[PDB]
Design a protein around this ligand. Structure first.
Ligand SMILES: O=C(Nc1ccc(Oc2ncccn2)cc1C(=O)O)c1ccc(Cl)cc1Cl
Lengths: 253, 254
């Protein structure tokens, strides 16, 4: 069957490219400065932040630590819609019961946000506003009582995750696997979900063998990173359990 | 290399048998009423508990289960030493691997002693119903339920002891443990255990698609039980100040 697996891999990669404007390949070029096109504007302290809001557009703009957290919310809501559009390209996804489609996205978007956030991170900071900015890890830590410990665990995961050296080709299938997980609560029909994931795990396995022939247990290592993601999502919602009515409706989650 | 991985699978299954007196194959023969094994006495209420026993009830049961974790930990420690490379790791790492790995292992193997209706006790001589455990006093009525919800799901994989042997080995040799000094040697070992396991699942479960994937995905549930379990011990400590914890169990819960 090792050809419709490579076809499912090529399909997914193509959607991923259409759905996510800033790809890892692209994000990598900006972060390593390997492409010396334009440097991102760097936010490394309070004065550069304030200058950054003058230069960079920012669609979400009172208080600084709050303002940064809300910007992250805006972007997260944006990510949710990119992921939802991608989920629809996954073969068989749209044929699932509508409630299950909603359930799979509801519990899955967070894990995928972190996965793709790792694509925009290094040990020193995170690319923001479509790669136009770069917010340092040290500037984020230097934030208030609850807010300075909000991005750190993402950076810690990213450093780990990024050491697998996956590319967009690999990430495209990996994200599809996350979405099609039949253990989400309240699913009504788990069978066709487990079926599609079985098919996606099979394509992810062959992809990793062909694309990373020298790292034998990369598949396993990647699967055990999925459990890492569930952990980070848990302690994050628990952090959102400390932190205008219409806006609080847009950001219900 | 295939032959090398098969040899490793054989080695670990062999040490598992020598280390764990109550195997899943034994537990299944007791639970499903075979003729290789005897039938357990069933504890389903305070009456059965009393006639079965051959300071309050919930505390007696909880402490009983606590003493069984101590035996498990001893068995687990004995089995780890047989995993090739484990005893050659830095001693501090050995302790860390055991400290964190042991609870995930206890709950994995405890699934072998469980069905949806209860769990085997006293080396399989007894069987305590899920409901008798679910009806215990306010904090102690909660302690077994996450393990049952896990067991029901974990058991649906239909793993046998030769699979579990390698999977337990993978659990112990995790380089994600807090405070590990040399992550690399641990990961090289795990890479090989993972290869062996992968081969084992393909060979032993040839009809069962992505069992390797599906089994590694079972770590999330293991982490959740552990987290919820240590939270419950914090509660027990504050409300039951006269109640004890075993030195070995003190060491681990940190
Ligand atoms: O953390 C994220 N984004 C931001 C967080 C804070 C922020 O806040 C901010 N920065 C500078 C000045 C004011 N506010 C802006 C963004 C962004 O992407 O633009 C983020 C969230 C999810 C995803 Cl998928 C990607 C990113 Cl880059």
């Amino acid at each position: 069957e090792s050809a419709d697996l490579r076809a499912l891999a090529k399909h997914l990669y193509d959607s991923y490219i259409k759905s996510f404007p800033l790809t890892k390949a692209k994000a990598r070029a900006i972060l390593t400065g390997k492409t010396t096109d334009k440097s991102p504007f760097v936010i490394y302290d309070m004065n550069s932040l304030m200058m950054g809001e003058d230069k960079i557009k920012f669609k979400h703009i009172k208080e600084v630590a709050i303002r940064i957290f809300q910007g992250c919310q805006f972007r997260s809501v944006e990510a949710v819609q990119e992921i939802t559009e991608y989920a629809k390209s996954i073969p068989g996804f749209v044929n699932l019961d509508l409630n299950d489609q909603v359930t799979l996205l509801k519990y899955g978007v967070h894990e995928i946000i972190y996965t793709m956030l790792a694509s925009l991170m290094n040990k020193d900071g995170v690319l923001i506003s479509e790669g136009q900015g770069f917010m340092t890890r040290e500037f984020l830590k230097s934030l208030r009582k609850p807010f300075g410990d909000f991005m750190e665990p993402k950076f810690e995961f990213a450093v780990k995750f990024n050491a697998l050296e996956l590319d967009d080709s690999d990430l495209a299938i990996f994200i599809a696997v996350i979405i099609l997980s039949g253990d989400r609560p309240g699913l009504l029909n788990v069978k066709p979900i487990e079926d599609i994931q079985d098919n996606l795990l099979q394509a992810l396995e062959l992809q990793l063998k062909l694309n990373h022939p020298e790292s034998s247990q990369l598949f396993a290592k990647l699967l055990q990173k999925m459990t890492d993601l569930r952990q980070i999502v848990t302690e994050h919602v628990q952090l959102l359990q400390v932190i205008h009515p219409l806006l609080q409706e847009i950001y219900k989650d």
